[PDB]
């Protein structure tokens, strides 16, 4: 399950509020790395720390994890390749 990967990675069980589809080039302009296919940006919000937790996976039906991005209130983010 997607929310399980997030908990497994952040130690906090968060709720995915939205999933946005992005093409390889769009992602590259931000991650600095080009994915092999289209990706879905599953986003959850952490009210305690005031930060957005984004889990990037391939499209359906696989939903293969590709990266985990944590972004703070300043817009700065920490990326982790999965």
């Amino acid at each position: 399950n997607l929310s399980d990967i997030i908990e497994k990675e952040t130690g906090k069980q968060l709720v995915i509020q939205e999933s946005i589809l992005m093409l390889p080039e769009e992602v590259e302009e931000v991650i600095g790395n080009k994915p092999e296919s289209d990706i879905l940006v599953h986003t959850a919000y952490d009210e305690s720390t005031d930060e957005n937790v984004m889990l990037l996976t391939s499209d359906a039906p696989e939903y293969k994890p590709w990266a985990l991005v944590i972004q703070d209130s300043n817009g700065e983010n920490k990326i982790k390749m999965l």
């Binding site: 709720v15 995915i16 509020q17 939205e18 999933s19 946005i20 589809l21 992005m22 093409l23 080039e25 769009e26 992602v27 302009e29 931000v30 879905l40 940006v41 599953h42 986003t43 919000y45 957005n52 984004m54 499209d59 359906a60 039906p61 991005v69 972004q71 817009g75």
Partner: protein, 222 residues
């Protein structure tokens, strides 16, 4: 001109009728699908063809319980404001005088003013994002856009993200006004969405044509 008149032929296509069939068969076998069936076409109910002033393109409905209700980006009253909509609000707070953060994400008042909030895929299976892709919805919404392009003049299109921008190739850029930007999602919001002024530009276009601007401040129906 109404949606009823222009979409008459399309509703007769085998593919369109089978898309409705697949959804109906899935709901009957116990699969939870969002939105509720009665809300699936709300974008068309609240904004009639001849009333369309602005078109904002979305992808597919929210896949969580109680979120989606047939409009792109909007969520029911009492539901937490999703990340993309929150960013849209932020853009509105620092570009429109007197705007203040609404405290709910219900956007029916926008639709009622001529803003067609259209998702490209109209249904989704619970907890499974983009699960109803390539079933017929895209073919149908491609046609809807093509019809607005053909039967209306001077409509403003707000295309956010590469996926939505590609769909904007069917549009005649001289007859209509097309505006592009990165998606409002937190991942890309800082690469062009914030400061795109789409909401201001949209109203300026309407004003110079002698049309009423859009009051972007969402209101809960009493």
């Amino acid at each position: 001109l109404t949606w009823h008149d222009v979409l008459a032929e399309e509703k007769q296509q085998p593919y369109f009728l089978n898309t409705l069939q697949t959804v109906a068969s899935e709901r009957q076998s116990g699969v939870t699908i969002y939105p509720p069936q009665k809300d699936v076409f709300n974008a068309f109910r609240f904004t009639e063809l001849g009333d369309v002033k602005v078109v904002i393109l979305g992808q597919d409905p929210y896949h969580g319980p109680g979120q989606a209700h047939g409009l792109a980006f909007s969520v029911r009253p009492g539901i937490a404001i999703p990340p993309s909509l929150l960013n849209m609000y932020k853009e509105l707070e620092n570009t429109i005088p007197g705007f203040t953060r609404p405290n709910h994400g219900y956007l029916e008042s926008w639709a009622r003013q001529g803003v067609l909030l259209l998702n490209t895929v109209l249904t989704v299976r619970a907890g499974q994002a983009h699960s109803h892709a390539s079933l017929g919805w895209e073919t149908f919404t491609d046609k809807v856009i093509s019809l607005i392009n053909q039967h209306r003049e001077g409509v403003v299109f707000l295309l956010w993200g590469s996926h939505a921008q590609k769909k904007g190739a069917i549009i005649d850029k001289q007859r209509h006004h097309v505006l592009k930007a990165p998606h409002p999602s937190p991942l890309s919001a800082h690469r062009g969405f914030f400061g795109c002024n789409h909401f201001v530009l949209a109203n300026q276009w309407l004003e110079q044509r002698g049309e009423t601007p859009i009051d972007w401040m969402p209101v809960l129906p009493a």
